[PDB]
C-alpha cells in the first residue's frame, strides 16, 4: 500500500527535524541525520559495510543543516527538495527490483546512497544490503530489521496497536486523558502511573497506544510512537535512551517499573510502580520535580464487569468457548468479595480464563457415559477370559457365548462415540467461525484507519453480519448436548473460586439476596436463642443493603450487652462465616489488652481490613478502651473510612462492627429476675451506657443488642449442636455417636454456669466424653463403623458398642 | 535436551502415580491465554519432575485432551 | 521378573493404539502363571544358607536406627 512502518517513521523523523531546526525544504541531510543515529543504525551498518564511513557522512550532513536559512511559520517544512523526492521515488523502483512488496529502510538507504555524492555505488550497496539478511519485506510478528536499541530492547506498543495485536483496554478515560495531559506539560511531562499490582496500570499505557493509532489522541501525540522498555547493562541502556532523544520526542518511552536526559527535557518517559516505591522516588528531587503521579485505583465491580464484557470476545475466541455474562458478573463479584490476594481487574479475568481453560479440556476430553461403558465392558471382559477357563462345557459355555453377546455394549461404545465426534464436529466448525469473526474485526478496524472505506464496507456490512450469525447459529446449534457445553457459567467460576477458598455450595448457590433473607435461619443453626440479637443484626444488615443508609458507614454496627458466654462472640463468629462464607472473615481486637500505645498498634487493624474489606471486626470489652481508640472507632462508625499511619485510607464500608461490653449486664440480669418489662430494662441499661459512652458513639450505633441468659433447653440445644462436630469428625471413621437424653442433660448440666455461661460446656464435653471415647478408640474397643452408645452412670458417662 | 514424551512412548519412564490433580492443573495452565506457562514450585525430592514426566506419559497415551494430543515435551539440559 | 516387566511394556504397546487383536490383548489371564510361580517359588527359596530375598521392616528399621537409635522402639513401639 505504501512504505513499511520503519522507513515511514524515518521520513516523519526527518520531517520533524526540519521543523525543529526551523528549515523550509525537507532535504536529504534531514533524512540522513535521523537514519544515522548509532553505529548500530542500519543506515550506518549497511553504509560502513559498503566502504564509506557513516560518521563522516553524518558529520558533514549535519554541517549542511547548520548552514541552512531559518524561515518561519507556514514556511517551515514547507516542501520536499527535488533530490529527496527523486530518491524517495527511486526507492520504490528498487523495492521492485527485489520481490520486497514494500520499501524498507535499507532499500531507502540505497536511494539516498545514490542521491548523495562521495559515497559507494549501487554495486557494493545492494551487496551490503543483501549481505545482511537476504529476506523479503512483509513484517508483522518477530519481523523487523532489528539493529536498533529500541527494536532490540523494547516492545513497540503503538505498533502492536497498529497491527491490532493489543487487547481492548476499556473504561479508563480519566487516567488516559490525564496522561495525555501530563504528556504535554512543559514543567513535568513525564507521567508515572502509581497503583497496586493487577489494577491495570499497563492497560492505561497500551490503552493510550491504541488511541494514538486511531487518531483518538489530540495533537502533539497524533503521530507519536510508544515504546515499552523491558529490562555493561547501562551500556545498552544508554544506547536506548540516547536513541529515543534522537527521535526527537516523536517516541515516548514507557518504563514498566536517565536523569540527565530529563535534565534536558528531551527524554519523554511514562512510568508505573508501587505507592511507596514512588514515595522512595519521592526522595530524589531531580525526579519528583519532573514526575507527575497518576494513582490508578482498583476498578469497581461494575467497572470490572464492563472490562470483562469488553474482552469477553477475545477470550472465548481463544478457548473456543462461550463465556456467559452471568459468569462474568460472578468472576467480578466473587473475586472482589472472597479473593484476598490479587486486585480486581486481574483476579476477575484469571478466574474466567481459569474457568474457560478448565472447561476447555473437558470438551476436548472423552465424555462420561463413554468412560462408563469403557469400564462396564472391561469388567465383563476380564470375566470372559476368566470365564473360559476350567472346562465344564455346560455352565461356562453358554455364558462364554452370551458374554461376548452382552459385550455387544461395544455398540454404544461406538454409537455415543459417534454422537460425540458429531458434536465435536459442529464445535470444530464454530471455533473456526470465531477465528474469522476475530480476524474480520482486526480486518475492519484496520480499514477505518487507511480510510479504505471500500474493504471496511463489505466487512462491517455483509461479512461481520454472517460470521456473527454463523457462530451464533452453531452456538445455538448446541443448546442441547449430551456430551458438550460451550458455556462458561457461575458454577464453573464459583468452582475455580472455591478451589482457592471454600465450599462452592455457598460461593455459588447463595446470592447476596438469598443469603440475606435466610440470614436469621443460618445464624440460628449455630447460635442458640438470643433471638432479639439475631433479628436486630439481621434487620440492620438487610436495612443496610437495599440502600436505606448512608453509603459512608459500616454495613452495620452493634453493641452486644448482657451476660458472658451466652452467644456474643459466637454470633460474631457465625455472622462472619454465614455472611462472608468463612470464619476467616473475623478480626478480633481484644481491647482489654490494648491499654498502652493502642492507637499506634492499629495503623494493624487497618491492615487486616486493608486486605479483607468484607470482614467482621470484634472489639472486646469496649469500655476498657481509652478515649484515643474511640476516635479511631468513631471514625469508622462515621464516614466508614480510616486514615492509617502512612496515609492511604482503608475502606470499612464493607465491614460489620461488633462491640461487646458487660456494662449493663448486672442490671439486665436484675431486670430479668424481678421480671420487669423489657422496655424498662433497655431504658434503665441505656442510662448506664450514657455514663461511659459519648452520645456521638451510642447514636452512631445501628443497634444496641442485649444478650440474655440461656434456658436449660437452649443449653441442651447447644449440647446437640456442640456434639455435631464430634459426630462429623467421627464420621470420617464411620463411627456413630448416639447419646441418651440423660447423657445430653448431664452435659447440659455440667456445661452451663450462672456466671460463666456455656463456656464450660466445651471443656466438659471434652473431658466427660471425648477423653474416654479417645481411650476406647486407641485401645481398639471402638473400631471402624461401630455405633457407640453413650449413657449416664454414677459420676459420668459410660460407653457401649452394640453386639 | 532429553525428549521425555519419547521415553514415555517406549515405556522408558518410571510409573508416576498419585498426582492427577497437579497434572490436570498443569494441563489447564498450558491452555490459558493470559498465563499459559506453569511453573512447579516445591521442595527438593517432592516429585516436581514426576508431575512433568507424568504428563509426558499421558500425552503418549492420548490420555491428555486436544491441543496437546500430539505435543512433544523436551527437558532442557 | 524380567520377562513380566517387558510384557507389561507390551500390553500397553497394543492398547495404546495398534494391533490389539494379535498377542498383547488379554494374555492378562494367562500371565498370573508367572505371579503364581514367583510366589510358590520364593516360598521354596525361603530358607537358610543365604537365600536372602525378602526386605522387611526390621531391615528398614535397622538402617533407620543406624541413622537414629534403637529399632526396639522405632519399630515395635506402635
Ligand atoms: N482497563 C482495562 N481494560 C481491559 N483489560 C484490562 C484493563 N486494565 C487491566 N486489564 C487486564 O489486567 C491484566 C493486568 O493489566 P495491567 O495493565 O498490566 O495491570 P497491572 O496492575 O499494572 N500489573 P503489572 O503490569 O503486572 O504490574 C491484563 O490481563 C489486562 O488485560
Ligand atoms: N447462644 C449460643 N449458641 C451456641 N453456643 C453458645 C451460645 N452461647 C454460648 N455458647 C458457647 O460458649 C462458648 C463461648 O460462647 P460466646 O457466646 O462466644 O461467649 P463469650 O462471651 O465470648 N466468652 P469469653 O470470650 O470466653 O469471655 C462457646 O464454646 C460456645 O459454644
Ligand atoms: N510420583 C512418583 N512416582 C514414582 N517415583 C517418584 C514420584 N515422585 C517422586 N519420585 C521419586 O523421587 C526422585 C525424584 O523424582 P523427581 O520427579 O525428579 O522429583 P524432584 O522432587 O523434583 N527432585 P529435585 O529436581 O531434585 O528437586 C526419584 O528417585 C523418584 O523415584
Ligand atoms: Pt538540528
Ligand atoms: Pt512521498
Ligand atoms: Pt479438566
Ligand atoms: Pt433441545
Ligand atoms: Pt473468630
Ligand atoms: Pt485495645
Ligand atoms: Pt483490661
Ligand atoms: Pt483431562
DSSP calls for A428-459: HHHHHHHHHHHHHHHHHHHHHHHT-HHHHHHI
Residue minimizing CA distance to atom 4 of ligand 2:
A527
| Chain A / chain C CB contacts < 8 angstroms | 8
Going from the C-alpha of A592 to that of each of A86, A595, A667, A685, A690, the distances in angstroms are 89, 7, 22, 22, 21
CA A419 to chain CA mean position, Å: 38
Residue of A346, A348, A361, A371 for testing the chain B interface, max B β-carbons within 10 Å: A361
Using the Cβ of C28 and the Cβ atoms of chain A, whether some distance falls under 8 Å is answered with yes
- Decide whether any atom of ligand 1 lies within 6 Å of the A193 Cβ: no
Contact partners for chain A, using 3 or more CB pairs closer than 8 A, are B, C
Task: Tell me the helix, strand and coil percentages in chain C, rounded to 5.
Answer: 55, 0, 45
Distance from CA of C27 to the nearest CA of B (A): 19
**Ligand nearest A481 Cα, by number?**
7
CA A602/CA A622 separation, integer angstroms: 15
Pocket probe for ligand 3: among B43, B47, B48, B73, the residue whose CB has the most ligand atoms within 8 Å is: B47
- For chain A, first and last CA: distance in Å? 93
DSSP string computed for A507-539: HTT--HHHHHHSHHHHHHTTS-S-HHHHHHHHH
Between the CA atoms of A133, A136, A138 and A141, what dihedral angle is there, to the nearest 10 degrees? Answer: -40
d(CA A795, CA A693): 48
Question: Does the CB atom of residue B41 touch ligand 3 within 6 A?
Answer: no
HSE value, Cβ hemisphere, 13 Å, CA-based, for A454: 2
Residues in chain C with CB shorter than 8 Å from the CB of A381 are: 26
A381 touches C: beta carbon within 8 Å: yes
CATH number 3.60.20.10 is the correct assignment for the domain at A299-502: no
Show contacts of B34-37: CB within 8 Å, 24+ apart. B34/A349, B34/A350, B34/A353, B35/A350, B35/A353
Tally the residues of chain C.
Answer: 78
- CB contact burial A574-612 (16+ within 10 A = b; e otherwise): bbbbbbbbbeebbbebebeebeeebeeebbebbebbeeb
Experimental method: X-ray
Pocket flag, ligand 1, residue A200 (CB < 6 Å): yes
Asked whether the beta carbons of A157 and A206 are under 8 A apart, the reply is: yes
- A599-606 contact pairs (CB < 8 A, 24+): A599/A628, A599/A629, A599/A631, A599/A632, A600/A645, A602/A629, A602/A632, A603/A632, A603/A642, A603/A643, A603/A644, A603/A645, A605/A632, A605/A642, A606/A642, A606/A644, A606/A645, A606/A650
Contacting residues for A577 by C-beta, under 8 A, at least 6 apart? A526, A583, A585
If you measure CA to CA, which chain C residue comes closest to A389?
A: C29
Interatomic CA distance for residues A218 and A178, integer angstroms: 12
Taking the CB of residue A141, how many other CB atoms lie within 10 A of it?
Answer: 8
Q: What is the resolution of this structure in A?
A: 3.0
Query: 3-state SS of A720-744?
Result: HHHHHHHHHHHHCCCCEEEECHHHH
Tell me which residue has its CA closest to atom 21 in ligand 1: A198
Which residue positions of B form the known binding site for ATP?
42-49
Query: Do A148 and A42 contact (CB within 8 A), yes or no?
Result: yes
Distance CA A484, CA A368 (A): 11
Q: Is the CB of A527 under 6 A from ligand 2?
A: yes
A592: left (phi over 0), alpha (psi -120 to 50) or beta: alpha
Q: Would you call C26 an interface residue with chain A, using a CB distance cutoff of 8 Å?
A: yes
Chain C residues with CB inside 8 Å of A389's CB?
29
* Burial profile C41-66: b = 16 or more Cβ within 10 angstroms, e = fewer: eeeeeeeeeeeeeeeeeeeebeeebe
Of ligand 1's atoms, which has the minimum distance to the CA of residue A257? 27
C25 part of contact set with chain A, CB < 8 Å: no
Does the beta carbon of A568 lie inside 6 Å of ligand 2? yes
Is B62 close to C12, i.e. CB distance below 8 A?
no
Q: Domain locations in chain A?
A: 1-132, 148-298, 299-502, 512-709, 710-803
CA of A167, closest atom in ligand 1:
31
Which CATH class, in words, describes the domain spanning A148-298? alpha beta
CA-nearest residue to C26 within chain A is A385
Long-range contacts of A758-764 (CB under 8 A, 24+ apart): A758/A565, A758/A566, A758/A710, A758/A715, A758/A718, A759/A564, A759/A565, A761/A715, A761/A718, A761/A719, A761/A722, A762/A722
- Closest by CA to A161, choosing from A102, A203, A103, is A203
Q: Could you tell me if the CB of A618 is within 6 A of ligand 2?
A: no
Closest Cα in chain B, distance from residue A381 (Å): 21
Say if CB A621 and CB A593 are below 8 A apart.
no
Ligand 3 and B73: CB distance under 6 A: no
Distance set, CA A309 to CA A174, A302, A325, A408, A783 (Å): 20, 11, 7, 49, 56
CB-based contact A315:A353 (threshold 8 Å): yes
Residues 48-67 of C with CB under 8 A from A: none
Task: Give the whole-angstrom CA distance, residue A319 versus residue A264.
Answer: 49
- The residue to mutate among A569, A620, A707, having the most atoms of ligand 2 within 8 angstroms of its beta carbon, is A569
Residue A633 in contact with residue A626, Cβ under 8 Å? no
CATH 1.10.1780.10, applies to A1-132:
yes
Give SS3 for A689.
helix
Q: Helix (H) and strand (E) counts for chain C?
A: 4, 0
A710-803: what fold?
Answer: Helicase, Ruva Protein; domain 3 (1.10.8)
Residues around ligand 10, an ion, CB closer than 5 A: A 592, 624
**Nearest CA distance, B62 vs chain C (angstrom):** 8
CATH of A512-709, one of 3.30.70.3040, 3.30.2130.30, 3.40.50.300, 3.40.50.720: 3.40.50.300
- What is the whole-number distance in angstroms between the Cα of residue A539 and the centre of ligand 8? 22
Distance, CA of A638 to CA of A697 (rounded, Å): 9
Contact residues on chain A for B24, CB-CB shorter than 8 A: 361
Is there a contact between C28 and A382 if contact means CB atoms under 8 Å apart? yes
Give the residue, by CA position, lying nearest to ligand 3 atom 8: B47
Q: How far is A358 from chain B (nearest CA, A)?
A: 6
Query: C36 in contact with A at a CB cutoff of 8 Å?
Result: no
Q: How many other C-beta atoms are found inside a 10 Å radius of the C-beta of residue A440?
A: 18
Residue A584 DSSP one-character state: G
Distance A360 CA to ligand 11 centre (A): 10
Identify the residue whose cell numbers are 495503623: A603
- State the smallest CA–CA distance between residue C53 and chain A in angstroms: 32
- CA A68 to chain centroid, in Å, comes to 56
Domains A1-132 and A512-709 belong to one CATH topology:
no
- Residue A761 CA to ligand 2 center (angstroms) comes to 9
CB A61 less than 6 A from any atom of ligand 2: no
Among all ligands shown, which has an atom nearest to the Cα of A197? 1
Q: Judging by beta carbons within 10 Å of its beta carbon (0-12, 13-18, 19+), is residue A415 exposed, middle or buried?
A: exposed
From the alpha carbon of A272, which atom of ligand 1 is closest? Answer: 22
* Cell numbers 462465616: residue: A577
Amino acid at each position: 500500500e505504501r512504505w513499511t512502518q520503519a522507513a515511514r517513521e524515518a521520513l516523519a523523523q526527518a520531517q520533524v527535524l526540519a521543523q525543529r531546526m526551523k528549515h523550509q525544504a525537507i532535504d536529504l541531510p534531514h533524512l540522513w541525520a535521523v537514519l544515522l543515529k548509532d553505529e548500530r543504525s542500519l543506515a550506518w551498518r549497511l553504509l560502513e559495510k559498503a566502504g564509506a564511513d557513516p560518521k563522516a557522512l553524518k558529520e558533514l550532513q549535519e554541517r549542511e543543516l547548520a548552514r541552512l536559512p531559518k524561515v518561519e511559520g507556514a514556511e517551515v517544512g514547507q516542501y520536499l527538495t527535488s533530490r529527496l523526492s527523486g530518491a524517495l521515488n527511486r526507492a520504490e523502483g528498487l523495492m521492485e527490483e527485489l520481490k520486497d512488496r514494500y520499501v524498507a529502510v535499507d532499500t531507502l538507504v540505497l536511494a539516498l546512497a545514490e542521491a548523495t555524492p562521495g559515497l559507494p555505488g549501487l554495486e557494493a550497496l545492494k551487496g551490503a544490503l543483501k549481505e545482511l539478511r537476504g529476506g523479503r519485506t512483509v513484517q508483522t510478528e518477530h519481523a523487523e530489521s532489528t539493529y536498533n536499541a529500541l527494536e532490540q530492547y523494547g516492545i513497540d506498543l503503538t505498533r502492536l496497536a497498529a497491527e491490532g495485536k493489543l487487547d481492548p483496554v476499556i473504561g479508563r478515560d480519566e487516567e488516559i486523558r490525564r496522561v495525555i495531559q501530563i504528556l504535554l506539560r512543559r514543567t513535568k511531562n513525564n507521567p508515572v502511573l502509581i497503583g497496586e499490582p493487577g489494577v491495570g496500570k499497563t492497560a492505561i499505557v497500551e490503552g493510550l497506544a491504541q488511541r494514538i493509532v486511531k487518531g483518538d489522541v489530540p495533537e502533539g501525540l497524533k503521530g507519536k510512537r510508544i515504546v515499552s522498555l523491558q529490562m555493561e547493562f547501562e551500556e545498552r541502556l544508554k544506547a536506548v535512551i540516547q536513541e529515543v532523544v534522537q527521535s526527537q520526542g516523536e517516541v515516548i518511552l514507557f518504563i514498566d517499573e536517565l536523569k540527565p536526559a530529563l535534565a534536558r527535557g528531551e527524554l519523554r518517559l511514562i512510568g508505573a510502580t508501587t505507592l511507596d516505591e514512588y514515595r522512595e522516588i519521592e526522595k530524589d528531587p531531580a525526579l519528583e520535580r519532573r514526575f507527575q503521579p497518576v494513582y490508578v485505583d482498583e476498578p469497581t465491580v461494575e467497572e470490572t464487569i464492563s472490562i470483562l464484557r469488553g474482552l469477553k470476545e477475545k477470550y472465548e475466541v481463544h478457548h473456543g468457548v462461550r463465556i456467559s455474562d452471568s459468569a462474568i458478573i460472578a468472576a467480578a463479584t466473587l473475586s472482589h468479595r472472597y479473593i484476598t490476594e490479587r486486585r480486581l481487574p486481574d483476579k476477575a479475568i484469571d478466574l474466567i480464563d481459569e474457568a474457560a481453560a478448565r472447561l476447555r479440556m473437558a470438551l476436548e476430553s472423552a465424555p462420561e457415559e463413554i468412560d462408563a461403558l469403557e469400564r462396564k465392558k472391561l469388567q465383563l471382559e476380564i470375566e470372559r477370559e476368566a470365564l473360559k477357563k476350567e472346562k465344564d462345557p455346560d455352565s461356562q459355555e453358554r455364558l462364554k457365548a452370551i458374554e461376548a453377546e452382552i459385550a455387544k455394549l461395544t455398540e454404544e461404545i461406538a454409537k455415543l462415540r459417534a454422537e460425540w465426534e458429531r458434536e465435536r464436529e459442529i464445535l470444530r466448525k464454530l471455533r473456526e467461525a470465531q477465528h474469522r469473526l476475530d480476524e474480520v474485526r482486526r480486518e475492519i478496524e484496520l480499514a477505518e484507519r487507511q480510510y479504505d472505506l471500500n474493504r471496511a464496507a463489505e466487512l462491517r456490512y455483509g461479512e461481520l453480519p454472517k460470521l456473527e450469525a454463523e457462530v451464533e447459529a452453531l452456538s445455538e446449534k448446541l443448546r442441547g448436548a449430551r456430551f458438550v457445553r460451550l458455556e462458561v457459567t457461575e458454577e464453573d467460576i464459583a468452582e475455580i473460586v472455591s478451589r482457592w477458598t471454600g465450599i462452592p455450595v455457598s460461593k455459588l448457590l447463595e446470592g447476596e439476596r438469598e443469603k440475606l433473607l435466610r440470614l436469621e435461619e443460618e445464624l440460628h443453626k449455630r447460635v442458640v436463642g438470643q433471638d432479639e440479637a439475631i433479628r436486630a443484626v439481621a434487620d440492620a444488615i438487610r436495612r443496610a443493603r437495599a440502600g436505606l443508609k448512608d453509603p459512608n458507614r459500616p454495613i452495620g454496627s452493634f453493641l452486644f450487652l448482657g451476660p458472658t458466654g451466652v452467644g456474643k462472640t459466637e454470633l460474631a463468629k457465625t455472622l462472619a462465616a454465614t455472611l462472608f462464607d468463612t470464619e476467616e472473615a473475623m478480626i478480633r481486637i481484644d481491647m482489654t489488652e490494648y491499654m498502652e500505645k493502642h492507637a499506634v498498634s492499629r495503623l494493624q487493624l487497618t491492615e487486616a481490613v486493608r486486605r479483607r474489606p468484607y470482614s467482621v471486626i470484634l472489639f472486646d470489652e469496649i469500655e476498657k478502651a481509652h478515649p484515643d481508640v474511640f476516635n479511631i472507632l468513631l471514625q469508622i462508625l462515621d464516614d466508614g473510612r480510616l486514615t492509617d499511619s502512612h496515609g492511604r485510607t482503608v475502606d470499612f464500608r464493607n465491614t460489620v462492627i461488633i462491640l461487646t461490653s458487660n456494662l449493663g449486664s448486672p442490671l439486665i440480669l436484675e431486670g430479668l429476675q424481678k421480671g420487669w418489662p423489657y422496655e424498662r430494662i433497655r431504658d434503665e441499661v441505656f442510662k448506664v451506657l450514657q455514663q461511659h459512652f459519648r452520645p456521638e458513639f451510642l447514636n452512631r450505633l445501628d443497634e444496641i443488642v442485649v444478650f440474655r441468659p440461656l434456658t436449660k433447653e437452649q443449653i441442651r440445644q447447644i449440647v446437640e449442636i456442640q456434639l455435631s462436630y464430634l459426630r462429623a469428625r467421627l464420621a470420617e471413621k464411620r463411627i456413630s455417636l448416639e447419646l441418651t437424653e440423660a447423657a445430653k442433660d448431664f452435659l447440659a448440666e455440667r456445661g452451663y454456669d450462672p456466671v460463666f455461661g456455656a463456656r464450660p460446656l466445651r471443656r466438659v464435653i471434652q473431658r466427660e466424653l471425648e477423653t474416654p471415647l479417645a481411650q476406647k478408640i486407641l485401645a481398639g474397643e471402638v473400631k471402624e463403623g461401630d455405633r457407640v452408645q453413650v449413657d449416664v452412670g454414677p459420676a459420668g458417662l459410660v460407653f457401649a458398642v452394640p453386639a
